[PDB]
């Protein structure tokens, strides 16, 4: 559960 | 009211003598997190997140006993509205700029390897496997959610490209080898600086943690710091085989859609727009 | 001296850090080099090096206990526990500072400090009833009898006749102590090893350091340390709050407490800390 592109 | 005033009884008990209005609250997805000097207090928003919080505490306990070469947020206190107090990991993120010093890059790459190795080794431990989430077909679930929720927001060419990326995902073996942070971006890795070269202090934001495929964490690192640095980590750690590279690239290519998917659900139009760039 | 002798290794473990800027705590087996964020155990002998694998395991076990606070977390990889010996062991450094006694003269502070001690000691007690913990930690038998022997052998030669007579009466009661192996026992829980954050409010327990003497043992040993440091009123508050104010426990504490300066002296003697030996031997020479 990559947030803002990670 | 305000969250600090609202939760003041608990805060006076957990942080005796600490002025609540001098605290900060980080507005998390599931948890309202009150930030004190050396610890945080996690408060659930939903009754869902309130229900899960006991298991979260158990998960953090397990993480606090692993050998990762660094600190994690250690459970100091849990109870009841449920709450969980975690130790606060010291240090700040490393800006990509620092990696332009090759001797910094070497030392930072080395400590990432230790961390990733520690996570890898931990996945073999059955104790860990018992306590941590280990969902199957997480990627086919993701794909169905993208098609359902995101495809309507996309252009024709957008949908075609995404379908290509979601196809690649079915090529991936559903590996559950390692402990996987799941969101191992730059902001979640904290360092001690201005005392010689950077030393890894610890890792935070374990909300997405699971038993899974380590390529996910490696992808996250490369997203934050670029191809050269990831290559450095992959070489030092002996993870530079084609098989790994394919999984990393496949996972990496989903990052914009992941951001769009979660920004769609929580009505964050800035993140959604950014996530859908090139897909519409 | 130590920092000098180990310059090369320390420049590997702490790159870019000036070794002169570091501090040293002397141990029986290891010299402990203190950096800003971490601590490096350097073995004094081959024997000491052979002990560090087990020490790594012990510290990992402690890092997993529910104590309400931090402990020095091992920064090696888990496989280090399988080694025959290690040339060093790096641990996380617990933040904060000791609480000076006079802080406890405020009664609200004392309540809050006592309660956190209780959380710590309660966590240690329940862990000592855990089979896997008990299997991982040392649990010597007849330690009191042997301790008295060690004092007589190693410290009496440094004492006056008056001092030896004082010690003898203190060692006297030890042989009739019940030999209790029920709690995880720090074994050196003086104020200097209990670290607090007191920036944003009343003192908050940050964590506990210097677990060199940790074992499965008698919780009265840790309560004695507290009593020696802070005196009867504060101790009694901990006992009341923890549910440990019964006559048996209080008696064991009194007996052990009478030996605590000797324990510090014995340790200082073995680890070559002349200042802590002088303090420990106060009124014994």
Residue numbers in the entry:
A (entry chain D): 1 to 6
B (entry chain A): 1 to 80, 87 to 286
C (entry chain B): 2 to 286
Cite, word for word, the article reporting this structure:
In this study, we focus on a resistance gene cph, which encodes a phosphotransferase (Cph) that confers resistance to the antituberculosis drug capreomycin (CMN). To confirm whether proteins in cluster I also confer resistance to CMN, three proteins, Cph001 from Streptosporangium roseum (accession number: WP_012891209), Cph002 from Streptomyces sp. SID8364 (MYT78782), and Cph003 from Streptomyces filamentosus NRRL15998 (EWS93654), were selected for disk diffusion assays. The polypeptide chain of Cph001 is folded into two domains, an N-terminal lobe domain (Met1–Gly97) and a C-terminal domain (Ala98–Arg286). The C-terminal domain further divided into a core subdomain (Ala98–Ala140 and Thr182–Ser246) and an α-helical subdomain (Pro141–Ile181 and Asp247–Arg286).
